[PDB]
Amino acid sequence: MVYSVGLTGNIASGKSTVAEFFSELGINVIYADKIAKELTSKNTPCYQDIISHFGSSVVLNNGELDRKRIRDIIFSNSNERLWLESLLHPVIRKKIEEQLIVCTSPYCLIEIPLLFNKHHYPYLQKVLLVIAPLESQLDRIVKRDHCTKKQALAILATQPNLEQRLEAADDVLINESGLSELKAKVNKLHQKYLREAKIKQ
């Protein structure tokens, strides 16, 4: 229906910044993560199933979901990552399709998770994977998490291997030198996607 580019990134890759640069070029960006939060708002069906599944530990005093805790669980327990992805996939897909129907840009960017199920995103024309070198990731993680460098390395040490996702990706944006070059790279990708969407039916 619409020429769609999947946006993925490893840890502390700079990918939300990449999304913003695409946004600022007039491209419609669909944020699957934002949709997931929406559809796990207080007393939504998925919110209820999540709390019943994981139990009271993932409910803050707020009655809001403990999203930090859930991320920790999802990252360390693959069976739970898959369970949660299976739960949310049907509702998230319906929201994505709504936004695609009203897409006003020449192509669309869909921000999706690093280890996204392809069977759930078979309609993507392209996949873009944003990565940052180890040093850059640590700096980003220490500043965001306020943690020790050795804890950041330990966090990076446990990330999923990218070999398979690097192979599959049509384009890999190495974010290795500041915001200005990042913007320049996004610009060239933008022109590439415009070109390919123009000649693709």
Q: What is the CATH number of the domain that holds 80?
A: 3.40.50.300
- Give residue 21's domain range: 1-201
Structure tokens at 34: 């934002």
Residue type, 21: F
Find tokens 């992805």 and name the residue. 85
Q: Are 153 and 195 in contact (CB under 8 A)?
A: no
Q: Are 133 and 174 in contact (CB under 8 A)?
A: yes
Q: Cα-Cα-Cα-Cα dihedral of 170, 175, 178, 183, to 10°?
A: 10
Annotated binding site: 12-17
CA distances from 121 to 40, 77, 94, 126 (A): 21, 22, 12, 11
Q: Give the burial class of 111: count Cβ atoms within 10 A of its Cβ; 0-12 exposed, 13-18 middle, 19 or more buried.
A: buried
Rounded to whole angstroms, the Cα distance separating 127 from 25 reads 18
CA distances from 191 to 22, 25, 184 (A): 11, 10, 11
Rounded to whole angstroms, the Cα distance separating 140 from 77 reads 24
CA 86 from centroid of its chain's CA atoms: 16
Residue 7 CB neighbour total at 10 angstroms: 25
Rounded to whole angstroms, the Cα distance separating 109 from 24 reads 12
The angstrom resolution of this structure is: 2.1
Residue type, 120: H
Structural domains of the chain, count: 1
Residue type, 5: V
3-state secondary structure of 108: strand
Annotated binding site for ATP: 12-17
3-state secondary structure of 131: strand
For 145-195, give the DSSP string: H---HHHHHHHHHTSPP-HHHHHH-SEEEE--SHHHHHHHHHHHHHHHHHH
CA 196 from centroid of its chain's CA atoms: 23
DSSP annotation of 63:
S
Nearest Cα to 3, choosing from 198, 189, 197?
Answer: 197
CA atoms within a 13 Å half-sphere pointing along the CA-CB vector of 8 = 22
The experimental technique behind this entry is X-ray
Structure tokens at 43: 């007393």
3-state secondary structure of 4: strand
Rounded to whole angstroms, the Cα distance separating 88 from 85 reads 5
